Each structure stands twice: as C-alpha cells, then as structure tokens.
Design a protein around this ligand. Structure first.
Ligand SMILES: Fc1ccc(NC2CCOCC2)nc1
Length: 185
C-alpha cells in the first residue's frame, strides 16, 4: 500500500480511558494497570472494558496511523463514532458505531456482526489503520508482513465524527500486560 503519506500523529485521551488504564506522559502508550488508577469517574470513561479513544476527531479526508501490539494475547483496534456507548455491555459492530479487528485466543477476527475470520500467516507486531472518510473505507495492514492487507470495511456509514479506538484487553492470564503503542511516523 501507499497510504503512509496520510500519516497522522495520534494521542490518547485520558478522560475517555477505563479507570484501570495507565497512559504514558507522551499520550502515545497505554497498558492495563493491576488496580484502579485513582482517577474520578466521568460520563466519557468506558466502564466495562479496558478501552480508550484517541483525542483526534476526523470528519473528512484520508488518515493513516500504526499501532504496536508486540507480545499481546488480546486487543481490539480500529475507529469508532464519537457518540459510541461508554457504559455497560455492548458488541463491537458497525451497527454500534465501531470498525475494528481483534486478536482473541490465538485467532484474528473483524468486528462485523457476526464476526469474520481473518487469514493471517505472519502474526503482526504492528498494525496499520487507514480511514478514507469520503469513500466510507477502513482498512487494516500487517506492517510485519510488508504491509499486506488484513481486512477492508467498505460502504461504511460513519454517521458522525470518528475517533481512533483501542482496547488493551484484560490480563486474567498474566500473559497480556504489554502496552499498545502508537508508532512514530
Ligand atoms: F512486548 C512487551 C512489552 C512490555 C511488556 N510488559 C510490560 C508490563 C508492565 O511492566 C513493563 C513491561 N510485555 C511485553
């Protein structure tokens, strides 16, 4: 792919984070803490899951960024509507305002309803995410495998501003403590 030139500098929005997340000083890395991180509750925070949004909002154009997932057992990545539900249980689907892929139990799946099996021969250590607002496209790339395509959501009905979306996953196993990191341009 030749999307690298639409690179954008993404930072994480502390105020949207689940209360157990630890966001680095530069707002470029996030990981699961072993306890509540001593923040006040607010209506923006994801309550049920270890999720956080990027600060940037996109309503036009072409945008590209990269995320490091090295050594993680579970995570979700993509974009979502600014107005997604924050509290309680919900599925990751375009009907609920999410365009995502994930790793769970040694399989990769796209967040369609129902979910779609992905075919990845080289487990990725870094994921590239491309959004074309006008075209209604969200695409995912395997940076570890020379940029190979993972998945394309097309005919997307965004229906509002978009925000970068992250889930570090739970760490019940003790094998999923590693952070998500926004990779340099
Ligand atoms: F690839 C990695 C990177 C970090 C990590 N674990 C971190 C958990 C919290 O203490 C710092 C290290 N595991 C795998």
């Amino acid at each position: 792919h030749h999307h690298h030139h639409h690179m954008v500098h993404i930072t994480l929005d502390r105020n949207t984070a689940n209360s157990w997340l630890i966001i680095s000083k530069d707002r470029r890395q996030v990981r699961m803490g072993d306890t509540h991180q001593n923040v006040s509750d607010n209506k923006e925070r994801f309550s049920n899951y270890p999720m956080v949004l990027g600060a940037q909002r996109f309503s036009s154009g072409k945008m590209y960024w990269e995320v490091d997932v090295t050594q993680k057992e579970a995570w979700d990545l993509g974009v979502c509507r600014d107005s997604v539900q924050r509290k309680g249980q919900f599925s990751l689907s375009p009907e609920n305002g999410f365009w995502t892929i994930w790793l769970w139990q040694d399989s990769y799946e796209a967040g369609t309803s129902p979910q779609t099996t992905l075919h990845i021969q080289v487990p990725p250590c870094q994921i590239g995410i491309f959004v074309d607002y006008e075209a209604g496209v969200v695409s995912f790339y395997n940076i570890t495998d020379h940029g190979s395509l993972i998945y394309t959501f097309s005919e997307c009905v965004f229906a509002g501003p978009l925000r970068p979306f992250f889930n570090v996953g739970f760490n019940y196993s003790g094998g999923n403590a590693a952070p998500l990191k926004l990779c340099p341009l």
